[PDB]
Design an enzyme around this catalytic site. Structure first.
Site, PDB file in Angstrom:
ATOM      1  CD  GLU A 259       0.213   3.414   6.075  1.00  0.00           C
ATOM      2  OE1 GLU A 259       0.956   3.403   5.015  1.00  0.00           O
ATOM      3  OE2 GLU A 259       0.356   2.884   7.228  1.00  0.00           O
ATOM      4  CG  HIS A 260       4.749   8.064   8.084  1.00  0.00           C
ATOM      5  ND1 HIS A 260       5.045   7.240   9.897  1.00  0.00           N
ATOM      6  CD2 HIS A 260       4.904   6.620   7.233  1.00  0.00           C
ATOM      7  CE1 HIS A 260       5.977   6.300   8.746  1.00  0.00           C
ATOM      8  NE2 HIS A 260       5.515   6.536   7.680  1.00  0.00           N
TER       9      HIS A 260
ATOM     10  CD  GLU B 228       8.413   3.996  10.264  1.00  0.00           C
ATOM     11  OE1 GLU B 228       7.211   4.031   9.439  1.00  0.00           O
ATOM     12  OE2 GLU B 228       7.800   4.119  11.552  1.00  0.00           O
TER      13      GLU B 228
END
Ligand SMILES: CCCCCCCCCCCCCCCCCC(=O)OC[C@H](COP(=O)([O-])OCC(O)COP(=O)([O-])OC[C@@H](COC(=O)CCCCCCCCCCCCCCCCC)OC(=O)CCCCCCCCCCCCCCCCC)OC(=O)CCCCCCCCCCCCCCCCC
Ligand SMILES: CCCCCCCCCCCCCCCCCC(=O)OC[C@H](COP(=O)(O)OCCN)OC(=O)CCCCCCCCCCCCCCCCC
Lengths: 54, 440
Positions: free
Chosen positions: B59-60, B136
């Site tokens: 997804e990143h 993150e």
């Protein structure tokens, strides 16, 4: 830890074990830790050969 | 309309399928904007301990370039039309969607197929995203709610892949290679597990033609899913440097397709939610909310019904100072018990009204409807209409709520997460005893 669940149940188990020992004494050897001369009424004229506390 | 005619007048979700098994679903309106996305049956629960975090990593890298649109080009295209590209990942689902103008649906659809089909997964980008994902992770450590729910999942589903976090441990983040990610995409980004949803000013026939022109290459027509044992258990992380404590308690709740979900949600609406920025405070119908406002027992509490395919987390999360955790537990479990034994019809009526309002208000805008369509086709294989949800709510009463809360809450072992100054978080045996009543 909170007293209630842990040491109430542990103290109950300890109390049951203590009751076991106490009832073994009461029901199987009532006179183990006592003295036969106290089944003789007190005689201030005659003294027992042995006068021990408990 | 009388809300019964308005439910009957809601537009119908149209669903089709490609030969490869990609499902295409759309709810049309007359709005000049649309949301179109791909929802994939892929998550962390599909990862083992070595691959855990690969889906979040993919997804990143999703928008960082495809073989057709290198790097920023894709972003430029999106930005050059006013569209918005978003993505998310859970333990079970993954989503990539665009909010665009209705005349941008072809390009949007094209942009999506490329993204799911032809991600570059370039090693340089993989290292840059490695650094980003580590930062993150440290950012997520700062969020006490995220941590407490990761803890709840970790102890409730220990030994199962549902205990895994979405992002994975930082060691996997450092170790995941391009081969790991290409394998993850090749085994999970398949047409039979994907749904192309669109809500808004979108004609279903045109979207179907777009999907047949852009997605037909995908896998035609295999490792997937083992059940996850639930465990009554607790994980307590004490940090008295934290100003407030977070406590999450959940029993094993139903999975997605279980009808018990509708009464249980009703029951959760009876308990409700609260934070210290509420107008109603002491006058709230929820007993816990009024006690929390009157005594200032907590900063917030929320009920939750997290669902997975076969199990879930049914419970409550609350935030409070160190000297009130115990009270917050006592009044919360009591409410659970009060619902299991003495539900009462009027508050069941209130909770039913709350649930209908939540369901209707949630589906406001093209994006919530697009998510509803995609996630619904993944979890139920169908879009359940709001008229049907209303039929299921209408068949709830206090007997039904009492029975289902008894089935799930009463005399059940909960899973417990504590984070912060949690010395006054009650011992697990005391909570477990709070899960039944001696009067009953
Ligand atoms: C009859 C069976 C018992 C019964 O119906 O109890 C109902 C009721 C407890 O009902 P519940 O709904 O399970 O309690 C939830 C409450 O919110 C209470 O919630 P709480 O968090 O405040 O307390 C939870 C827990 C807290 O734990 C305790 O209260 C500890 C109990 C004593 C532990 C040992 C202490 C040292 C000796 O409560 C109990 O264990 C039950 C109440 C106290 C009973 C004490 C019995 C002592 C016998 C010696 O207790 C009473 O009404 C007490 C009087 C009646 C007892 C029999 C006469
Ligand atoms: C000797 C009496 C029993 C002592 C051992 C049991 C005990 O400590 O508690 C038993 C019973 C259950 O108490 P508890 O698990 O705290 O649940 C209360 C409701 N939440 O807690 C009780 O107080 C039971 C009272 C029975 C009368």
């Amino acid at each position: 830890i909170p007293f209630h669940p842990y040491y109430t149940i542990k103290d109950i188990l300890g109390a049951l074990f203590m009751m076991l020992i106490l009832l073994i004494l009461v029901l199987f050897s009532p006179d183990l830790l006592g003295d036969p001369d106290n089944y003789t009424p007190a005689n201030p004229l005659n003294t027992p050969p042995h006068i021990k506390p408990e | 309309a009388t809300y019964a005619q308005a439910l009957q007048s809601v537009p119908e979700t149209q669903v089709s399928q490609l030969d490869n098994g990609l499902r295409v679903a759309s709810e049309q309106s007359s709005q000049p904007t649309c949301t179109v996305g791909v929802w994939i049956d892929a998550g962390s629960r599909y990862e083992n301990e070595k691959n855990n975090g690969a889906g979040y990593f993919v997804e990143h890298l999703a928008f960082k370039g495809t073989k057709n649109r290198p790097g920023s080009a894709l972003e430029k295209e999106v930005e050059s039309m006013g569209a918005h590209l978003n993505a998310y990942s859970t333990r079970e689902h993954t989503a990539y969607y665009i909010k665009a103008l209705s005349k941008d649906l072809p390009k949007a659809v094209e942009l999506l197929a490329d993204i799911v089909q032809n991600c570059s997964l370039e090693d340089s980008q993989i290292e840059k995203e490695r650094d980003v994902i580590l930062q993150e992770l440290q950012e997520n450590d700062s969020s006490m709610r995220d941590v407490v729910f990761d803890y709840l999942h970790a102890t409730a589903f220990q030994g199962t892949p549902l205990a895994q976090s979405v992002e994975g441990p930082s060691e996997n983040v450092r170790k995941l290679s391009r081969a790991d990610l290409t394998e993850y995409v090749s085994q999970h980004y398949k047409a039979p597990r994907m749904v192309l949803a669109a809500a808004g000013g979108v004609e279903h026939r045109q979207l179907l033609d777009l999907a047949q022109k852009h997605f037909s290459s995908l896998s035609g027509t295999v490792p997937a899913f083992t059940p996850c044992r639930f465990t009554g258990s607790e994980i307590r992380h004490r940090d008295d440097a934290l100003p407030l404590a977070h406590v999450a308690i959940a029993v094993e709740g139903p999975g997605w397709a279980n009808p018990d979900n509708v009464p249980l949600q009703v029951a959760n609406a009876i308990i409700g939610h609260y934070d210290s920025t509420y107008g109603g405070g002491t006058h709230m119908s929820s007993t816990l909310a009024s006690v929390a406002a009157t005594r200032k027992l907590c900063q917030s509490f929320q009920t939750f019904n997290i669902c997975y395919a076969e199990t879930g987390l049914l419970g409550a999360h609350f935030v409070c100072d160190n000297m009130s955790i115990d009270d917050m537990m006592f009044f919360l479990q009591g409410q659970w018990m009060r619902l299991c034994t003495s539900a009462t019809e009027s508050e069941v009526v209130r909770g039913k009204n709350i649930l209908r309002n939540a369901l209707v208000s949630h589906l406001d805008g093209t994006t919530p409807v697009c998510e509803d369509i995609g996630r619904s086709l993944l979890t139920y294989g169908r879009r359940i209409p709001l008229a049907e949800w209303e039929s299921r709510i209408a068949e709830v009463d206090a007997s039904v709520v009492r029975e289902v809360c008894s089935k799930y809450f009463y005399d059940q072992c909960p899973a417990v997460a504590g984070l912060g100054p949690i010395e006054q978080l009650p011992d697990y045996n005391r909570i477990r005893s709070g899960m039944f009543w001696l009067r009953f």
